[PDB]
Amino acid sequence: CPGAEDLEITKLPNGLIIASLENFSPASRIGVFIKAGSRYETTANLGTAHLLRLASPLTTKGASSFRITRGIEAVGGSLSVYSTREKMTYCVECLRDHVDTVMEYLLNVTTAPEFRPWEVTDLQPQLKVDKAVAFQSPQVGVLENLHAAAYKTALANPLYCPDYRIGKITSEQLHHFVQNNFTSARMALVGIGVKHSDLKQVAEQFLNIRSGAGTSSAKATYWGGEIREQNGHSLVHAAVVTEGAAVGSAEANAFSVLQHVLGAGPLIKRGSSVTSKLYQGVAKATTQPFDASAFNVNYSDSGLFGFYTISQAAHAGEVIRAAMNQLKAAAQGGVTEEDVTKAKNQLKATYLMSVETAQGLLNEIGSEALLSGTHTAPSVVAQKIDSVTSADVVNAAKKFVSGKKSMAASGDLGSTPFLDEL
Amino acid sequence: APNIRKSHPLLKMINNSLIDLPAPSNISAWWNFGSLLAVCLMTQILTGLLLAMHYTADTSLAFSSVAHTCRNVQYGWLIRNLHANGASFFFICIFLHIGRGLYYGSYL
Amino acid sequence: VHNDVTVPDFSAYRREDVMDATTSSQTSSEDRKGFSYLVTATACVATAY
Amino acid sequence: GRLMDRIRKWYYNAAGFNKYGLMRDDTLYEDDDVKEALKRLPEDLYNERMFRIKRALDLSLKHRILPKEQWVKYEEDKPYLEPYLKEVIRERLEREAWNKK
Amino acid sequence: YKETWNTGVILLLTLMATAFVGYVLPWGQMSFWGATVITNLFSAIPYIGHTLVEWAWGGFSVDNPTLTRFFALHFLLPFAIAGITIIHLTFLHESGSNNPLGISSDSDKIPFHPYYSFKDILGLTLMLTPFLTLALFSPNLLGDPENFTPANPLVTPPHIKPEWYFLFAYAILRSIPNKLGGVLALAASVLILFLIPFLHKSKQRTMTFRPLSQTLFWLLVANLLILTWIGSQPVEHPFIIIGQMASLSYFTILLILFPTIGTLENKMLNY
Amino acid sequence: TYAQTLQNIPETNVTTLDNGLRVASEESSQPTCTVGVWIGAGSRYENEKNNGAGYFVEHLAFKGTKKRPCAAFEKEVESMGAHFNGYTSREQTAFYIKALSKDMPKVVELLADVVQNCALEESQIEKERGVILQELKEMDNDMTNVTFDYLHATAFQGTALARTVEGTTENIKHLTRADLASYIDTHFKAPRMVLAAAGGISHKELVDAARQHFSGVSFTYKEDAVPILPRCRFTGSEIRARDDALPVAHVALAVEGPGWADPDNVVLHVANAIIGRYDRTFGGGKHLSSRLAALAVEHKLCHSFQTFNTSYSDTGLFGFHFVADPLSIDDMMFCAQGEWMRLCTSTTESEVKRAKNHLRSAMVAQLDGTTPVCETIGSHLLNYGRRISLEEWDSRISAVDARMVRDVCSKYIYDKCPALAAVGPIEQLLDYNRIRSGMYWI
Amino acid sequence: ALLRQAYSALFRRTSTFALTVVLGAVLFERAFDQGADAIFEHLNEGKLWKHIKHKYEAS
């Protein structure tokens, strides 16, 4: 008759980190976190990381393409791969009694791929399809251009394989990528609904692709460019950012809070966001439908901060300028001490809700257990957050109005202002 | 192909002319004589063979072999009626088929 | 918009047992089919004969 | 001893597909398994196979064979498709076995 | 090419029925008695046999109603042959022709015209010379003189032998001294053809590169030659034994040796 | 083990405030929680004149109450980091909040204030009238939803389930402040509602704040009366909306389902699990266990397809839906109907074994977070009048076998007249009669 | 509930529907022939050899 439990976390000699947790949930969710991504690609192998993501179901040295799929489905399990510009996660879910079964596959996939030429050739046209459905959201398109304007390298690389390379990625390229990035010291084997002694055992007795830090990624160099895609759509999506804070950077929370102070997404269905400086400000400017939000990304060696808007074409001008004023105004002490209190609530709440779902929890554990083989207590994180002065926030706001900006906009940009008119 | 009715070289044909064949939704009874004619043909042939198997083509035996057919062959008389009248049925149908054609400009 | 679309009224055609909108049509289904299929089975008998 | 080897070498020469310049594997009947294996061959191995075959069909229509010096030698016959073919059959049996409950 | 092959076997059977009913028409001694021997074969079928035979005859023996219905059949069947030929060719075109090397010819195909239209016209005139030479210089070389004598229901010819193209099958029919056993043997002698596609064990399609199968193939051909010869002789020693041997080896080569040797050959190729 | 984890799950507690309301909640140790009120109301309860009222209400249920106007209501909710969402369907409505367990009580007050004292600001109403009209044009491009609306429109033609949740254009243009008011009063009533909460909350502390804000008790017996709705007649038929200008075509085929309370639903869900679903991004590809999915991949039969068992109080819709190019509709429909026949006729033990596992992890996944668990509770009491544990479900799922699947499927599918809805470039989809024939032998 | 019973037992399964058509034809034939043969003989009482026969029968 089960109860509470600890969040153990070993760290073998080769550098492989092992974090587990037993919440006695009838469902287990193991995963292999890795420091890999389009960030480590160079001009020569662009998109190789995208394809590698889709390559998860291909045959391995231990399991055939057929058995990987049939095996996992046999026990109502699942296998997926999520990835960012700098990290890749391979996770499987299934009922407790099948963790063994499902494990063999997760193992094989991440450490024993065969990238058979024919299988790879056959899979590449999928990149077109995958990319096609993703790009249905305008969001995804401008964020690609954004990173391409924000940086000159690494983080500048797109998350989806460029068109000229579909069908040109090779098996050697996939192998070399996995060999120089999927190294024991860049991986973490996180698990939920499992026992540490068990998960720990699987790792050491099965994980063989060995140690090293593999090929290290180039430093992210800021550019501050401007990309404009004139495609005629009735709505204009635009994002303006500035070099923000890095992951772990003390100046992080400051932006996180400034984010919520400005407006970080709706909280009421079909409702207006009054606690949103940015939304409310833009609202006062235009009469037509729109949307404005505080954009914020934190990467290993850098970050981006700014606002993302969506508006009718004719009112794109005023909507974007209105968003800017809300940032200046905030940089000029226009931030109440109560605003900072509320934001700190929404921020503590958001973080706390993020971990309700198994996917969100496992991701929280793993992410940190990967970038520092540790685990901050939900109290220390809260402790760190609220201990952010109104000064800090106003400073963050300043760093934005003063720093060099990069912009990306798509749609009928006939009325969309240029970065140098902001 | 997922279903035989479309892939098989023979069924494909039966399917494209008698199962999946696209037909106007409003064709009347005047469009029935085509298939009736086809059935007359199959019918005439069938009864014709049955008669041929007892017939004798010689001016001294023709008339009587037909009599022998109608008088001695089991259902000989029936088969002969069906063949003889079937020919009339055939012409009735071909004349209506033609009329339909002329009226509705099928000749185009 | 599609919201403004409704299926016309087929009362001038519906079989007696499915005329009422507040009555399960499943209770008269086996009879409605049994009947139609009876006609067919009968034609097959006459034809076989 | 070398009995089996002796026999195989005799048959190879007795068969005679080497007089057309064909490798043993070029002569396989293209059933389902073989067709799939062919699709996995690397570009060059595939184009070479094609030339050898087109060339043999030419010899066949001309009613000629290659000059004795170009006949493939039993020990130089390259089993280029066998490896692939085996994997293909191995996979098929797996599916077959697995689909039997 | 299974469907092409199977329709092909139907064509052989139909051509045979055609020749049989056609050969009865002149109504000579051989026409009558051969038609008697053949139609009476069906009476071997248990239970329904006697019934089917008298039905086919239209009476109690081969007679006038048998003749008139045979004429109708002979007139009709050739057209069934023509129709089924279209089906034959239709299945064939799904894949196109096979070739002597048994390897794909997609890399080297040519338009039927003028290559094969010319080649075929040539083949026609080459085989037309023997035909016409036989027809014009030896009209009766292949026929029984017994068929120049009007059918006599009361006198059976001393030596009742079938047309050359049915001899081998006749030889097989006689090999089994048992009435019903002989019929089955005969049936199988032709229906065996439907089984050929399932007895292929070779990894190669043709016998071009299979020396063992080639010997086996010519034995079979020679075996058919012997049966043909045996079928034209009277049932008496040594023929009777030679006949049973040939019949037996005929079925043996097709049912056992061919697939066995086929497997043996795959191993010698290290497959 | 698995079994053990199912038994050790905290029980769901339920209590009733004699005014007619039920309060249920499952307790965990989470600093965060979700609480909301699930009402047994929807478009089915509306009629020709007030169709789309419940939707119109869903638009104002968040624009302020009497005790606190718009801005005030919003600021208060926003400023505490809570999320306010809700929805309205054909037989069910819900308004729920996500926040810190530390505020469970203030939230309960907020909920009660929403369902009881909606301001129905005369001016806000005219403002939302124009918003709702814009959402109807947006949703009109959602083929999938246009298709399911049409499926209901014909499957339940002549009845209440035939109407869409959003309502008619005419109704939206003429609904009165009085109508909405009337709607709320007629339907948002204690006995027909459920206060559900999940997370780290005290059941007793929940029930208490409940008594305080949901107090109004009933005197007569008719005030504790939950009106049984008139039956909705299923009709085998088809509606075909053709527009060859649309890139792909949507098709949905269904037969009448049993309705919530029926145990057979456990089997229909196992059945749907065998057939599964698919879309062009399933890495598994040609190796997927779902036969229909495999065929779809091999023959490129469709962009996607999904099975479904939509339940209701007294009826339901069991069927499937697919999106395909105008030229592969016929083959897809063919294979689809083919798989349905194989279900009633040749299902295997191996097939159910897999489908059962897939179904178990499916149910467990519908309890991933506070909101989804809270949604289970609201729905369960409202539909089964009680919570059904994963352990019970598992108990029922475990009893299902091949034979059972065939019998139940043969029961609801075999030789039935289906309901058909097709939208887009559907010239290749054969006629009703041909589809009807796909309902037997195979 | 004949139509209902008939449907479930005979017309539902394509197999049973076929057996029903066979026995149906069998029963129908027997009944239809005898009936038709009666109707015919009745409409011709005293004219068939069946009717006259007795007068000259003397075997």
Ligand code: HEM
């Ligand atoms: C287009 C189809 C056919 C038509 C229009 C047709 C028409 C006729 C007509 C007009 C008669 C004379 C009937 C009489 O005695 O008054 C006849 C006789 C005959 N037909 Fe045909 N016939 C057809 C096909 C066939 C076929 C295919 C055969 C046989 C293979 C055939 C065999 C006979 C025979 C044997 C007779 C002579 C016996 C008799 O007159 O009853 N017929 N046919």
Ligand code: HEM
């Ligand atoms: C009236 C009888 C027949 C006719 C008119 C006929 C005609 C043809 C034609 C026109 C071809 C293509 C040219 C060729 O390859 O020769 C062909 C091919 C073929 N026929 Fe026949 N055929 C007959 C009987 C048979 C029989 C008895 C068999 C086998 C039992 C048969 C088996 C085949 C096969 C398998 C092919 C494929 C040839 C290849 O290897 O490419 N045929 N036939």
Ligand SMILES: CSC1=N[C@@](C)(c2ccccc2)C(=O)N1Nc1ccccc1
């Ligand atoms: C009408 S008698 C006959 N028809 C032939 C042409 C035939 C028989 C079987 C199959 C095809 C063709 C044949 O050889 N005979 N003769 C004959 C003589 C003695 C014994 C058997 C047949």
